[PDB]
Amino acid sequence: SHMREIIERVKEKTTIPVYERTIENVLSAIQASGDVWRIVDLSEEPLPLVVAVVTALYELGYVAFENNQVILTRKGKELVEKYGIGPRADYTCSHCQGRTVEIDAFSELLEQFKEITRDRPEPAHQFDQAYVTPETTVARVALMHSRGDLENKEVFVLGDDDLTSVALMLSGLPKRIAVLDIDERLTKFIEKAADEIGYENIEIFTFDLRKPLPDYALHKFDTFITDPPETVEAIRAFVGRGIATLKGPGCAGYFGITRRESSLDKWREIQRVLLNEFGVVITDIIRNFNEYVNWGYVEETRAWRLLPIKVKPSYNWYKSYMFRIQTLEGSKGFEDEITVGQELYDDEES
Amino acid sequence: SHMREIIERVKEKTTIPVYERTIENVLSAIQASGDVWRIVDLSEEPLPLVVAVVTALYELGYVAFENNQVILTRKGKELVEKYGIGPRADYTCSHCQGRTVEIDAFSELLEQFKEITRDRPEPAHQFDQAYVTPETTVARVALMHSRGDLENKEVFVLGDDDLTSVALMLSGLPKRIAVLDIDERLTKFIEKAADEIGYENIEIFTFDLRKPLPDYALHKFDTFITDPPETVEAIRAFVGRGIATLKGPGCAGYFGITRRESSLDKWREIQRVLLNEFGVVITDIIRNFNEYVNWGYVEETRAWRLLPIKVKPSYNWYKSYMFRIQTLEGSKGFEDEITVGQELYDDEES
Ligand SMILES: [Fe+3]
């Protein structure tokens, strides 16, 4: 009863749920790659859970670390063989990078975005607070336009590390754009890009999000976009605040949810929030739509700290799914005070 | 108050919910195409609802029918300018048709599936009883394998007009495949294909789906795939039964849901069944992944019957979204006897 032993070992190391499928996913990934960052990517299990699993595996003799790779031992090869776990294949589409949309027609926008963002603020120095690639940004415009959520729409951008607002301005599509960010380096940069483009229908909000929305944000938008912190409670706050900015039925929201930091037991809870507390409908969930830029900022992670391989990731391993929602009769957002501080941003899953 | 008048007119014609966004979707579609089947495709509103809308628009002076095309009158154009409604754009990826998966690595499977099915049972002559293209079918295999849900897995195929089991047999991936279908022309053909391929791990079930699952199907599979009829009650039944065939947490379901026949209010109800009745998580929702073959079998539709345009579709206009779900701790299917009748394949959404 090999698998049962592995499961119990991993459970000693985390409170995140552990299933056989968990082990299997990791095992499958390992056979495809020895790179820890890719293992996390391919397994689509949360980072701390992969670290727990890999640790449990090593402890029990199933894996080794050799020439800086994570690898199956003789005993490991027997294990995957016994359970019929093959290496994880992938067929992500090479032109759209799995995004479902192609950006050929936004070639000029892409280029103008890369140029204008030459000296954008540098990212915060954590792997999970990076901004998305330019291609992601432009692919988001493409998506949102193709669903009819941009042209002559009033669009609210809640947090804009990504500089989605800049893209939106270069698109010429919206009627107006509001951005909420207290990062004054961001909002200043956004202003400058606006002045440079001559775009007049942009506004900067700086209210406290923990506080009820002001009357100039409440029910005043057609579409919002946000990237919430990966906790249920932050998703409720950020997405629910986004929903509360919407006018009424027929409006759209876009946001990112990761497999890197949120287990599928957490995803279930997030989905029940959206469908029961808010009463909206999820119209799209697109795997790895969002690709985050990698600067090697992983040195605080347990993966870096406590595992013997100390190789930085060599590609944009950190990706999130695009969720699209739409409002309907009886939909609602989250309008209460957000009464938890920095604890909003972490949970039991690290 | 133009818009409010149109909404009222449309509500006289249907019990499906009607929003300003509904009208907008349609109007947006009309400016992109005059082909009624394309209008339904681009608007992503259900067929009868689009009919209602077009009819209302026509009655109120905003649309006309000319050269077999649905077009805007002068008064219509003034309507869309006033409300800022532009033509619907689309950026679906050319290479993968939006599926997120490319099938170049499956060129041999594709060729073999087309050859082996040259003489397949001809479709039922209902636009919505069609089977999917070969490319759809191969793209499903790629998708399901990329998530680790095929290789040495036991796969339950509930209804198989699409002949997925045949693709799956040619792929060589699963440990075993069971198909439930009472259309003996199909199951016979599946047997013929299995014998021709030499595949021995295929089984045909024919039990009554309304009756509780037998002990040889209950909790015996790793993955199921089904295309349910589109009513809340039928998705509860078909998807729920598929879930009751799975072993436990960590198992996968794949099925199709359309925008053609199910309003987004309906999708909300559907996802509440999945998240609250079954306790499953939706890991992917990919628009138009499934493309159905068109043979012009639309003569029963209101669209055909009552509009002055009488052109048959010139392309594969009928498409559904791919949902993937995964089981988790506390997940459950639908194990009860179904007492409701054919009443299950019919809803007020026509
Ligand atoms: Fe593609």
From Swiss-Prot, chains A, B:
This is N(4)-bis(aminopropyl)spermidine synthase. It is found in: Cytoplasm. It comes from Thermococcus kodakarensis (strain ATCC BAA-918 / JCM 12380 / KOD1) (Pyrococcus kodakaraensis (strain KOD1)). Pathway: Amine and polyamine biosynthesis. One of its GO terms (biological process) is polyamine biosynthetic process. It comes from the Archaea. The lineage of its organism: Archaea, Methanobacteriati, Methanobacteriota, Thermococci, Thermococcales. InterPro entries: BpsA, BpsA_C, rRNA_MeTrfase/Polyamine_Synth, SAM-dependent_MTases_sf, WH-like_DNA-bd_sf. Involved in the biosynthesis of branched-chain polyamines, which support the growth of thermophiles under high-temperature conditions. Catalyzes the sequential condensation of spermidine with the aminopropyl groups of decarboxylated S-adenosylmethionines to produce N(4)-bis(aminopropyl)spermidine via N(4)-aminopropylspermidine. Can also use spermine to produce N(4)-aminopropylspermine. One of its GO terms (molecular function) is transferase activity, transferring alkyl or aryl (other than methyl) groups. PANTHER family: RRNA N6-ADENOSINE-METHYLTRANSFERASE METTL5.
